[PDB]
Design a protein around this ligand. Sequence first.
Ligand SMILES: Cc1cc2nc3c(=O)[nH]c(=O)nc-3n(C[C@H](O)[C@H](O)[C@H](O)COP(=O)(O)OP(=O)(O)OC[C@H]3O[C@@H](n4cnc5c(N)ncnc54)[C@H](O)[C@@H]3O)c2cc1C
Ligand SMILES: Nc1ncnc2c1ncn2[C@@H]1O[C@H](COP(=O)(O)O)[C@@H](O)[C@H]1OP(=O)(O)O
Ligand SMILES: CCCCCCCS[C@@H]1O[C@H](CO)[C@@H](O)[C@H](O)[C@H]1O
Length: 257
Amino acid sequence: PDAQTVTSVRHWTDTLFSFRVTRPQTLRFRSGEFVMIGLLDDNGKPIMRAYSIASPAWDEELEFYSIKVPDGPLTSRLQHIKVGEQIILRPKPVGTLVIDALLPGKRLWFLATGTGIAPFASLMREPEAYEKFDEVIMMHACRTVAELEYGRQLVEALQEDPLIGELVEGKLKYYPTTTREEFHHMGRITDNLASGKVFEDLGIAPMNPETDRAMVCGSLAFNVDVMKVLESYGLREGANSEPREFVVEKAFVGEGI
Ligand SMILES: Cc1cc2nc3c(=O)[nH]c(=O)nc-3n(C[C@H](O)[C@H](O)[C@H](O)COP(=O)(O)OP(=O)(O)OC[C@H]3O[C@@H](n4cnc5c(N)ncnc54)[C@H](O)[C@@H]3O)c2cc1C
Ligand SMILES: Nc1ncnc2c1ncn2[C@@H]1O[C@H](COP(=O)(O)O)[C@@H](O)[C@H]1OP(=O)(O)O
Ligand SMILES: CCCCCCCS[C@@H]1O[C@H](CO)[C@@H](O)[C@H](O)[C@H]1O
């Protein structure tokens, strides 16, 4: 188990923060995968938790998007982490949110809620996504506007980039929504896909197995409800052994805070 150093921290809300750490020279992974990271308790025993790598495979540094669960063994501590301090990292990537587990196609959808946007923060900055697919749709649903900030700034920086800010724009469509606070676009991913509102707002054709591929990341309940909506459009679940139209992964275990 490696010990890497925090090089920067940013707090978004009273329950969300992101940070970057040095990457082990040897660590290799595919954008979208996750690894175990953690801290030591008081007796010096490791407290490890799965975490999607929020940064792309080519990024020399590792990024993470994290929840804050006071009373949560890991994040009650991790939320206090400072630049210069370190985290325990098991350099062994895994996960079902890899491009290789999807049949090639034209449109790739990223469906996420809460911190579930983490593996897509990585995949949206992954070159392969824009060369194996013509369009990338990022649907991010959270309760408030503030919880969408991390994703917004990330997406904004890609579209404003002097060199590719225009190459991405037009190919990457950002569709954030809130379900509690007022915002120009609201509603759950499931409802907006079922009613067809999102196809409407983005001016695109309905979803179909022939052109559409999807990756889902949220609570287990979300994942289940989303799978039903996807299957009702013709798409099917795939895997690395038998690639299909969509793949899913739990954003966290339990009902979530
Ligand atoms: C494949 C996989 C990947 C994950 N990737 C991330 C990630 O990139 N970032 C991240 O913050 N977490 C991620 N999680 C959750 C993560 O593993 C830990 O649960 C998180 O670090 C909280 O740990 P804790 O010890 O502070 O609280 P825990 O005791 O683990 O959880 C207490 C409760 O808080 C809630 N909770 C935990 N994590 C979240 C979350 N992210 N969002 C909303 N509610 C949550 C759940 O109800 C949980 O039961 C991932 C989980 C899995 C299974
Ligand atoms: N089973 C589900 N299907 C679709 N959307 C969900 C589901 N469960 C929660 N959501 C939504 O995902 C987001 C994050 O929720 P949470 O913070 O509780 O984990 C919220 O917008 C929430 O919408 P809503 O507020 O309507 O439940
Ligand atoms: C020789 C032991 C190296 C431990 C590396 C993994 C990080 S461990 C981590 O470290 C922080 C300060 O760095 C502490 O504040 C925190 O409580 C502790 O869990």
